Ligand binder design. Structure first.
Ligand SMILES: CC(C)(C(=O)NCCSc1ccccc1C(F)(F)F)P(=O)(c1ccc(C(F)(F)F)cn1)c1ccc(C(F)(F)F)cn1
Lengths: 180, 180, 180, 182, 181, 180, 181, 180, 181, 176, 176
């Protein structure tokens, strides 16, 4: 990692990178960077680049709730891909400030999970992932402006969206083409 | 491998052994041995020893359905232990002809299972193991003579029964102790 | 394996066993027995017991065409479970001679596959698994009496059937309960 | 690598913020305990802020954080982020009353202690008694912090039980929901 | 194995041989030895070769091929589950008129696969070899199917599946085998 | 690691290195580098050395879209090799500022991929990788000046380019041999 | 995995011995044992040794070679699939006029491979020995093929493939075998 | 392989095979065979084919002492190779009846050993392998008619002998070439 | 590593770069980075590249080689220990007149090594490509040694060791450094 | 940086298995010391079982090339290449500590491949053995023949025996 | 840093198994300390089960050779070479803590190869065992005969037992 090191200087310009699989510890680092920037200045926008194939729902939810919680607007920019929990956090950005780069791609689907144990415990845990599915679809509908029923239909199986399609789906607000 | 071998010669006396973990192939051996003894003589009792920790539920139901289908009474004898599907196949024997040896032990509990994938598939497979729990419990009421909601409670967790409690429970009819 | 071995002894009664995963070498053994049984007496029914979770499609189809090609009717009996390709070969028995036991279950779904390579290669194998899915669904519709659409809608995701449901669906013609 | 501003987690310690993240075990808990003492040392009056995102973990390790939280002069305010299961739910409900929060989409799981032993029957009895004594006390400390009766906590912890943020408020595990900063 | 002689032994005295699974030296040698035995036992009756194979080692397949062409008996081939690559090749190499697909078998054909490791000089020796192997396999297939060598070349560059009807139309087999007479 | 290391020192002169496999994390660091240099001087050229055999397409597209978006020209110099995604990122520098060293080579082909699962899902991901192949060829045709179908035939299979043939093909503009 | 009537045993009654797979001491000893036994059964009748091998251990192979020359009966060798390296040597080692290739079989010849680990002094002892075995192989190869020593040397420095026809014109084998007459 | 049993039938002609690594169990097999052929006719010759890289010394000496002990002369035939303890049992056959096939080769050397532990125990074991080295060289001098000192000088390092050389050295009496 | 700045960073101030061990992409890049920094620091003062290497990835070496010829300053190559294959190639590629062995270093040359696995068609592609690489390697070799391309071809078919004097005599290096001059 | 401080006293440590990267870090320290001062001695401490010859030769040629006299001090052991580099110190400056031990033997090697390549690589290791022997004779003042006779097998020398043999010059026991 | 900081107070820690690289670290710290002040005592805390003999001997020859006395202090355990280096300290300046323990025994070893080589390496470990036993007798004041009767098998000495044996000079109980 080349020399403030490269990421930490970009953090001074309110830039945060979410990269790779979503799990607790990289999630916590994003949360901490957001909380830190809100302290440095609750008025200025935060920029979160998202290149991710997805990952742990509860961990992405910590970034989501931090995203809504803090004062600053969190702008999202998708480069490479934003899949599943990655696509969910991209559309979670402040309305009007969610972006895809021209050849970034997006994928949405339904929650994934797995359990082993007794029938009683399996029902508990299956009941809970369905509640998570419903919560995601609602939040998904809310950020995209699609109906709940459109989210449900379209996430039952993997659905890919090009950058233009994700603009037209309401997942992002526009494409970043070149700096003016 | 003591010797025409010791199990095949024991089979000549209508004696079938269900040892160890219950799965598709060992269960198939027993299905075939029962079919064969039935072909030899539909009148005579068949003796099914059971020293088993349990195992795959559908594998066991292939034995259960075969026991109930074939004309001969299938007598069951618990030596060692009959746990989970082992207990089930022991109480499935012809009423009056189900026996624990003096120190054999019995354990009953609910189906174990699990699966991983999309929420929608998790739901389908949770539903299914719940349906199985229901049937298994119904079928246990049938054979032991206890109320459905008694079985449901006695098997939510691991529940041991000594040979006496297993008779008093309805699982077996009597204890074997000394040949007459 | 008990002793003439037990499976050989029941071959004499024109009973074949399909147990466990469908793959080439076990499927081959099953085919070899059908050809033998037909060469012994092309007019008598053959009895195929099925307890399997499914397996390789081409291996399963090899059994299927043999069942149809040979002179005898092939009666299919499901014990334990007949899943995926096991459900297919179950329903492919002689019309009117297809049976579930009271407590066996059936499950149906669409083909599984997978491949790695260049986009062009992926396309060739993807086209092929869809054709196979097409063929399987057509045959399922033929053997159950259900519309092609019904089959396709019901096989996108794993669907379970109790023995009663398997009869009401056209997978089997009746339940075997006791030997009359 | 960690971004620097002081790495990121050190700067947020200045504002008296501490993250509990991932599996609870001895060294990550001892890290948290050490921060809680530092904070109490740097200012015995100001509040400490403990972010919890955890599936739980080793009970004795969690109980080291817990006793530190009660022992210290500072009120410790806990904030659930993605999830607080098992020892994490316990430590969440253990923060200063009125200062325990769920983020709107965090979730809480409660259940009973896991464990087990291997050895002679005589020793199996000792270790079974111990985990039963532990389960008894934990139930009591959950009843105390949540406000639920001891019997209720028992019924509800025999099996896994999920609570959303609002249900966690209604249950007494947390006090309110943090939705937008004021 | 199930007795009646195990069941393959029983179908061997009816001149049925089973090519099943991957093609390699030892299963291929086993098929060759069955043909020679069936040829000794009666060189005037046909041999029945059931093929359910995904392919395998080319030189092991060619010991089966040369043995079918060599022995006096005709070798009739029936493809039951799949016959892919070397599997398809041995299927199409049966006695003309006596090559069948069961109705739901499939066939796949393509070009040789291989691999070498070592010095440039030996890489070239081996690369040139497999190209020649390719040229002979394409020739034998054209011969047995009646396609032009050029057609065989086009259709084997990449994997190509043929259903049982399509195989009949391609020349790869002679008839489908539906219900026994 | 000869250290403020040597790459940080080369960064000062707007020299970025792309070495080895393309993947999310080395790709993210090149994007962070590119962004940092724009912020320094959004007018001064940036130089990307490419010595790579390829890697994950979406990770390369994260770098590709960053090159086009940022205000500065990105000059691409290939040393050693630019294979697959590496060729793509090479041909994607500024027209006129794309170089090969004398004995470096270039290799181009089509997307490689692999999915497994249900036939329906195989179709979705097969269809996505074909979309990816088409959009890759379009941008390949756009940056080299060849036609969509010339790129299409030349990329069905692995195709090697000497540094002269790279120039002739429009993959790069010229060859650096000695420093002026 | 075998059929009974056992199949290779039955083919042994026709004086047919099989050399499949990699040459190593134990598979080789099995072939010497069948050769010795077949001699004792009748020292005048030929022996048929079908060869489909990539090669293998030299000494293990030399144990089949010397058995072949030692025994009274002629050992006719037949290549099916491939006879590579030690496999090829044993092919061309058959009785003169009775070594055959099947039409699409193939043959590859090269030089001894080995390796050693140890002290310089011991490295020399073993390197010399593998060079001496290389010299004895090229000689016995020059003998059985009718080629000069120098030609065998040049042609085996690196891997060299021979089609069935090129093997006949090289002296490895006497003639191809297309159909049972 | 080939039960027709090929090794059993050659044993009836008094032929024993020593193949592969010399260890207690295969050597016990050779001993058991020699014992049996003595008990069958203590006067006819026995024929030990040797193709062997050597092996454990005490395992081998059990074969050696059995060869001298039994009334029958044990003719030895090297075939392929006889190295180390293979060479020793080769030359240990009956005088005038030790043969090499023309292209067999022999290798001789001193014993190999390995020990770990306390210095006091290392001495006890190093003393022992020197004793075993002295005895082996002695016996080897006695069967080759070479001096002890010549044997000692030649076995310090690996020495290869061809079939003729092994005759010249006295390890075998002559070369079998063609059956008379 | 010892600090002094660490020992290698300190020798970089004296314009000394170390090429140690297997040649692969990341160690090659650090070498290229170093040379870009040394030219920038002073486009005229010589660069000293110590080489002790058994070889490695050709494209990775070729990134070093082309960086060496592009940059303005002369690159002086000092062999110590061993320069084998691509390491030999990079040592003889230093500034003409300034390529050295130390007295007991040894050099080894041979032809490219590679390996492919796949369809026959792609095997053709990659075998052609490695023959293309072998030719240019031989050509750049002859250029830097002065030997005829034919001589290079004959002497790199197999591993060929050269002592320090032999490498001087061959054109690989220009002289030997024995004691300090 | 304890080795860095000790480096300031012109002390370089040869520890453990000899291979390319540690040899190269050995060479880099010797060049740095020469540049810091070409007239002062360097002290190379050796505690090694040996290792890769070409790696040791890169250390050996550097010791001869650089201007400073490289004194060698054996502690623990110097076996095989470790003892070659010990005997290659500046004459009169090669030291054993009282309870170090020295082991000389012959090159070890191994190849796999074609017989032609086996002969190529075996010829080479015999060439290496001769030059190892040549240089061993050179620094100990024994004859090539004596060295060839003494190194065919493992051979242990104690500090006194290492002085008699010529491998080292004397024994350090206590600091004067 | 905590260990660097205790090194400034002339304290080195010998902890765990004795092998080449941890032993080199110890030797480097001793030469560093001797240079920093060749007149001031060095303190060596030993908590170790033993380990490689030649590595241990490089420590041992450094302790003897350098100017400063090396006072050794046993903490936890000093077994085998651990015990050897503990009795290696300056007479009068070797300590045990009250509840530390000490184990002595003979050298352990292992070779594999030709008989002639086994003899060579077997001979050498016996020489090593002689010198080891000779040095121990020296440092403990016991007779040679006593040391080897006592070390032929594992022998445990408590702190008072090791004072009485001559392995260390006194016990440390509380700071004064
Ligand atoms: C990128 C380029 C600036 C470059 O790497 N300089 C490295 C020197 S950094 C530097 C500079 C000033 C002060 C201090 C420093 C340092 F180092 F102390 F920090 P360049 O010189 C180059 C290109 C290719 C190669 C090779 F060998 F890999 F092929 C090599 N060098 C270059 C030249 C020409 C062009 C044109 F004309 F084509 F546009 C573009 N780029």
């Amino acid at each position: 990692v080349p020399m403030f090191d490269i990421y930490s200087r970009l953090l001074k310009e309110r830039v945060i990178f979410l990269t790779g699989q979503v799990e607790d510890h990289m999630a916590n680092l994003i949360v901490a960077q957001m909380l830190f920037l809100e302290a440095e200045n609750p008025e200025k926008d935060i920029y979160l680049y998202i290149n991710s194939p997805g990952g742990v729902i509860t961990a992405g939810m910590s970034i989501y709730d931090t995203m809504q919680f803090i004062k600053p607007d969190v702008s999202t920019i998708c480069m490479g891909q934003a899949a599943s929990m990655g696509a969910f956090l991209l559309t979670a950005g402040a309305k009007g400030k969610r972006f895809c780069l021209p050849n970034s791609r997006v994928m949405i689907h339904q929650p994934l999970g797995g359990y082993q144990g007794q029938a009683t415990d399996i029902e508990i845990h299956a009941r809970e992932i369905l509640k998570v599915k419903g919560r995601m679809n609602e939040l998904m509908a809310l950020h995209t402006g699609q109906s709940l029923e459109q989210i449900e239909r379209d996430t039952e199986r993997d659905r890919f969206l090009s950058a233009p399609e994700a603009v037209e789906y309401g997942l992002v607000d526009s494409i970043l083409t070149h700096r003016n």
